[PDB]
Each structure stands twice: as C-alpha cells, then as structure tokens.
C-alpha cells in the first residue's frame, strides 16, 4: 500500500493474514465463518500445505492483543482455468478446518449477487483496498494495516491511459483496473489478496481482489484487480459441497 | 415559434431561435417533458431505489430482497439485521 493511511483497528475486520510455515504469504478476505477468499498466484510456489494458517483480527504485527485469532486451513480451491504464473483467473477459495468466533474486530464481508455486483456496485467510484504489503515500492513491509482509496475504471478507459509498458498482459472479463496513474497510490505485491471493498448504503461488499499492480506506484499504470462478479455462481456451488480430501482441488470452472 | 404544442404534461415553453426549451415541473423531465420520472421504478435505475437487493418482476412493480441474514422492513426498501453480528457492518462505528 503506497500513499494510503493507517486503517484504525476494527475498521477493516474482514481482512485476514495468511501465514505459511510462520512466514508472510498473502492477505485475504473473510466472506463467511468457514470460507476465506484471497488471490491464487500466492500459492504457486508452495508444496507443504499443512502449515498454512490464517490469522484473523490482527492489526499490529508487532503486538499481540486478545483480538487475534488463528485457524488452520484444510482446503484450497482454485479454478481449473488458471495456470500458475499467469494473472488471468487470479482467485482462490480456502476452507478453514474450524470456524472463527465472530467478534467486534472479526466480521465477514458479504459476497454480492452477480446481478447486483455487475450493475450497481460496478458504478461506485471510490472503493477501498487494504493489506500489509510494502509501504513503499520495493521497500519494507508495514507493521500496521494500511488502507487505500482507489477509483474504479472500465477496461476500455483503462487501456488508453496506460503508459508504454514492455509487456501488457490481456485484461480479460475476469479483471478490472483500479487506482491512480500518477504514481501516488497503487496496489502493491505484498498486500495481494486484500479486500477491494465497496460501500452501498451502510453495507460493505467485496467487489475485487488485488492481483497485480504492475509492481508498485508505477507512473502511468494502474492496479489490476480480479473481478469477483464472474465467480459468485462458481464459488457457491463448491462452497456448499462436501469436504473432499484434496487439499488443493482444481475445481472445474464455471 | 412554439405554437406546435411542444411542451407535454404541464410544461412551459420559452421561445428560441429555431429551438424550443420546455420548462417543466419536477415530476417530468426531457426536451418536451415526455418522461415520467416517477414511473421508472426499474431495478437498473439506481438499484430500483432500494437499499441492498431488488428483483424486477415481469409486469408488476419491483420486489426488493436482502442479503443473507437480513430481513426487509415494512417500507419495502430498507433491510435490517437479524443476527447479532451482521455482514459488511463495522460494530465499532455504532
């Protein structure tokens, strides 16, 4: 997170911290008591799935207050149309071994209906992203949670404003750019999987997942987020399925 | 140059060079005020004037739903939480 401000404790409760073998891996978004949502590119370079732990209610990585909770994740689900090392189809669904206890600092974020997200939420300008990524471009990971306000742009308007990039991956129907092109604010890499929350009449909804911001705070470039409006039907079909023994299950899309 | 009955639904006209501007009441809008701003309760129009969810029926008026754990009030446009810890709401801000 570059150019943002510190999010007060309890103002960003749907964020989760994913730790593998006691190391920072990626952020995440809690949607219900059992399932958590984060990016898919975070799990390319991993082979020991037993030590994957999600931390909820954490705000300061240095201090241990009583609001912190940790649960083991027993299943990670990625769409079949995703190949590792690619930005397309960057979404992952994880099932905790045991549910979390909802407190004042831990509340889930609603997964909107596809029709509601495609018509009503997609036309709200300022949606907020949060994460524990590097506070400065290729710098040091922040100790406190950082929140950023970014504007949402369509792919058509986003493509023309882009600067001369050596490699421009295709922005499919499952992704959308959001942020500023002046290099002041952008979505970093360390905060990948963070919630791109959108507000509508006193309620907060998940509309995007940070996947790649073309590095961090790059001049003339935006932060491409994964569109969740294209996965609600796919997510819920297997979210209510039986607990298959596969830790990493390649569920067929859609 | 406004005798062709241009203003519709109680509008008032003002003369312009080859043009005709209609000064209409707030209930109508348009160049000729041919649009019924009250009679456009469709779900694509600002979510059908509803807080969380809506469902546009075929012929009759739109019906409004709510997200999981929410029940709509008697007004038909607002949703109230039912569980102790609702979704998408910060408990420290109340």
């Amino acid at each position, epitope marked *: 997170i570059v150019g943002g401000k510190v999010c007060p404790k309890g103002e960003c409760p749907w964020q989760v911290l994913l730790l593998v073998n006691g190391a920072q891996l990626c952020g995440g978004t809690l949607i*219900n008591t059992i399932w958590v949502v984060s990016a898919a590119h975070c799990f390319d370079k991993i082979k020991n799935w037993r030590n994957l732990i999600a931390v909820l209610g954490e705000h300061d990585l240095s201090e241990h207050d009583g609001d912190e909770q940790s649960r083991r994740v027993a299943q990670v689900i990625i769409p079949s149309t995703y190949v590792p090392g690619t930005t397309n189809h960057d979404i992952a669904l994880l099932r905790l071994h045991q549910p979390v206890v909802l407190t004042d600092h831990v509340v889930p974020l609603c997964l909107p209906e596809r029709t509601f997200s495609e018509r009503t939420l997609a036309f709200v300008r300022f949606s907020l992203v949060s994460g524990w990524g590097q506070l400065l471009d290729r710098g040091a990971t922040a100790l406190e949670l950082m929140v950023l306000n970014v504007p949402r742009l369509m792919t058509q308007d986003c493509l023309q404003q882009s600067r001369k990039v050596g490699d421009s991956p295709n922005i499919t129907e499952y992704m959308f750019c959001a942020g500023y092109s002046d290099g002041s604010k952008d979505s970093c890499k360390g905060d990948s999987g963070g919630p791109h929350a959108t507000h509508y009449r006193g309620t907060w909804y998940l509309t995007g997942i940070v996947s790649w911001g073309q590095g961090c705070a790059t001049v003339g470039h935006f932060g491409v987020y994964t569109r969740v409006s294209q996965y609600i039907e796919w997510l819920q079909k297997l979210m*209510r399925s039986e607990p298959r023994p596969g830790v990493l299950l390649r569920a067929p899309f859609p | 140059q406004c005798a062709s009955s241009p203003c519709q639904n109680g509008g008032s006209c003002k003369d312009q060079l080859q043009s005709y501007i209609c000064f209409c009441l707030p209930a109508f809008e348009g160049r000729n005020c041919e649009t019924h701003k009250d009679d456009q309760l469709i779900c694509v129009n600002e979510n059908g004037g509803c807080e969380q969810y809506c*469902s546009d029926h075929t012929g009759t008026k739109r*019906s409004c739903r*709510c997200h999981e*754990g*929410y029940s709509l009030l008697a007004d038909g446009v607002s949703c109230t939480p039912t*569980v102790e810890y609702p979704c998408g709401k910060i408990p420290i801000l109340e």
Partner: antibody
Amino acid sequence: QVQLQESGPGLVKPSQTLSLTCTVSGYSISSDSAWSWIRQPPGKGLEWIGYIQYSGSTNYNPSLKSRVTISRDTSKNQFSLKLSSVTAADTAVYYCARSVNYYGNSFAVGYWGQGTLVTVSS
Amino acid sequence: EIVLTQSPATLSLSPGERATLSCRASQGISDYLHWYQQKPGEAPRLLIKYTSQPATGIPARFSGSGSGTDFTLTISSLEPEDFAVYYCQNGHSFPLTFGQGTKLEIKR
C-alpha cells in the same frame, strides 16, 4: 453416526418453568455447529424457539425472546433450554436438532432428535 | 418475520401419478429454502437443501426448483412409502420459520 437425544420430565405445571436437556454423542458442541430447539404442538405447527451455536452466543425468536434462555455446558456435551411462564399453548413436542450447512447468517436442520412430548396442565 | 404459506393443505394422489407442492414466501429469500418430510411419529428429514440440491441417501424421485418468492417440490414417480407431511424451511433471514404443512394421503 452423529446422534442426539433429548431428556425431560414430560410434564410441567402452568405458570412454571419448562426445562429440557439434549445430549450429543457423535459431535463436539464447540467445533462447528448451531444447536436449536424446535417445538411442534398437536396441530403440527413447527415453531423455532431459538438456537445456540458454539462459543456460547445465543439468538432467540423475537416472538418469545422475553421468556426464553438457552445455555450449555461444554464439559458434559449437552445444551438445555429454560422457557418460563408456560401456558396451555406451550403443550408441544420439543425437538433437539443440529444445524447443517451453517455459515453464520443462517443454516439448515439436518440432524434431528427423537422429540419429547410436554403436557402443560394443572 | 417471514410468513411462509404452504399449498395445497391436503393432496390425494395415486402412486402412478406425480405430486407437485408449492411453497410461497413473503419476500425474496433467493435459493435459501430447504425441504423436509415428516412421517407420523418421526422427526422431519432434510429432503432437498437450497431448493435444488438433494441430500445424501434421498431417493432421486424427489426434486425441487424455483427461486425468490415461489418454490416447488416435485415427486416424479410417487411410491407408497411417500405418505408424510412435507415442510419447507426459511433459510435466509431470522426468525427461522417453517411451513404449515401439506398432508399427502395416498390412494390404493
């Protein structure tokens, strides 16, 4: 193999307190579940009295929220109900049940108890 | 409170026929509706969850459809063992509400 059964007196005088105890064997109350009490009068009018999920938090039906209390003791693997000021309308068969597909906001009812009939009379 | 109405109150159909049961809701509860069967003297059984997915061990003859306000419960090839009172449960918002019940007397 998860099974549950309720234990009660079978008769409670009106203007008194109604108590019922449900015992669970194949599942742990404090892992992942919402546990509810559902009653049915002889007219078979299924009514959801209330539910208590793990960690002790409770939510009750607003129709009778002022006279119901549901508690549990994790050590004994059982959870009970306390309905006070019972009238003739409370004569019903009370079912102990477990919630299936419980993800917070709402759930279903997959596992049911055998049901115990309670008669309210003087 | 979501008031749920079940119709018809009484239905009498032969085994060779098919039975259609309706479950209207006072609001749009999406697909969050579960169906139950209660044979007399026994606890209800979860037949169909979320109006489309059948449970485990449930015979394939039972099926469901609908979303929003109106829901339907279908028994394709009725059999003599289907005599029971069927219920649909609100599964979207509290207070959790069950149906009135539709008795299904079979002919022979």
